[PDB]
Ligand binder design. Structure first.
Ligand code: U
Ligand code: U
Lengths: 256, 256
């Protein structure tokens, strides 16, 4: 098992994965903030204050009441200043011809500002081929959704194996997974795990939580994705630091 | 087997399904236009000219370069005038708590103007529960994606059966399916089939085509969804009429 800093140098590493792994090692953070807010001002104030604590800020641009491309420009300024990637959790899940348009165009122009996006594998590999036509020229990366945190998820068994095969066959663009665990034995791939809180529980719409120690330490994932565990706390900076320290120590203790 | 007009009166019919089935029968159309354009002016000119030929206009609001809510107001005027439903092909596919916000809020406010949306079943039934908490009060309907037209689709076997169960257990909100065939034996549910052209072929990104006669007549679906077969033709009105007549006669010949 290699450190994040050593994985950043692997021969087959994608440049976006390398950039991420280097800033994870430099800043001692494997925390991705899930910035699940409706106001641009709150998104940007969280990005600025929590930027030093995170390797990545995950967006849902389509829930931002006051989205503009200028908001995205200000978010990029903060991502460059504090050194984190921007991940739009758009979950592309259409035919290749459609997702290429949804990624490049419309009002969001996601590919212009998102380092990373993700896709469901259920439509078959055309979803990746369509995205990669926009993303490769724009030097972007993609995550494939191999496992999901929600109750009744059908992303199990052969489905998860199909996501891993699709990733390992599109390594020029696919840099890793949304998963609950290590699903690929290839260290070039990133594992990002949502459904994370320090306390046991869930929500009223099928979300299930596991702790940073469980998903990084026992399940072998790389990065925790945390929304409400931080966003709903009074002091979001201290909450981010709690999650960062939990995920970082779980990572170190797996390394030995 | 019942006519569309008789299915509109079934005891367990959803009001949105009933409205659709009545206008299908009245206008002799089971054609859904896939309005896959980037200009509001082209979307509205297609909606006006093809409105009389279609039961439904399917949007991807996120590929419109000049989306505003006032464009959607103008589309609703045309939908009311010509009598067709608006279906936003958003393919919601996240945890329940997130999709509720993606459906109601952000820039698009999809629930404010879309009669129908659709969802992938892969996250489990929380995706439907989240959507239905916005959609039920707004008297909307939802389609579940049981099968997909694209090469390598994993929406087969047990996955398709899970989509049918999830629909039949959420019948207050779920009115049918995106599918390649009849997947439910319950006549209250609508089957809408994309991947349709008159000629054999596909695209370069995994789309596969079958004819209206195949999907309506042999495979027992209700509605054809047609994009490029119409949109790329010179005379989009005549193309819409050719698809309408094909789908309508295939439906009549299965009725006897
Ligand atoms: O399997 C998945 C994939 C994405 N997500 C997303 O991650 C975030 C989880 O937020 P939470 O920590 O508040 O539950 C939220 O934005 C979801 O849309 C999951 O929760 N689970
Ligand atoms: O299984 C599915 C579901 C949706 N769609 C959508 O239907 C449309 C197909 O358009 P086309 O006729 O131009 O191939 C397009 O908007 C797709 O996003 C499929 O093609 N297949």
């Amino acid at each position: 098992e290699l450190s994040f800093g050593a994985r950043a140098e692997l021969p087959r590493i994608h440049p976006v994965a390398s950039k991420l792994l280097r800033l994870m090692q430099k800043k001692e953070t494997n925390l991705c903030l899930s910035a699940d807010v409706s106001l641009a001002r709150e998104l940007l104030q969280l990005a600025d204050a929590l930027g030093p604590s995170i390797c990545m800020l995950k967006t849902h641009v389509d829930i931002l009441n006051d989205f503009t491309l200028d908001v995205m420009k200000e978010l990029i300024t903060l991502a460059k200043c504090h050194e984190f990637l921007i991940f739009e959790d758009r979950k592309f899940a259409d035919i290749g011809n459609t997702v290429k348009k949804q990624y490049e165009g419309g009002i969001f122009k996601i590919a212009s500002w998102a380092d990373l996006v993700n896709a469901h594998v259920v439509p078959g590999s055309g979803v990746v081929k369509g995205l990669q036509e926009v993303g490769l020229p724009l030097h972007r990366g993609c995550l494939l959704i191999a496992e999901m945190s929600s109750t009744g998820s059908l992303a199990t068994g052969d489905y998860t194996r199909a996501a891993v095969r699709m990733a390992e066959e599109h390594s020029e663009f696919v840099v890793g997974f949304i998963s609950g665990s290590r699903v690929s034995m290839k260290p070039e791939f990133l594992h990002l795990t949502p459904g994370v809180q320090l306390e046991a529980g869930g929500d009223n719409l099928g979300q299930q939580y596991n702790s940073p120690q469980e998903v990084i330490g026992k399940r072998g994932s790389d990065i925790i994705i945390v929304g409400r565990g931080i966003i709903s706390a009074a002091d979001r900076l201290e909450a981010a630091e709690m999650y960062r320290k939990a995920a970082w120590e779980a990572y170190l203790s797996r390394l030995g």
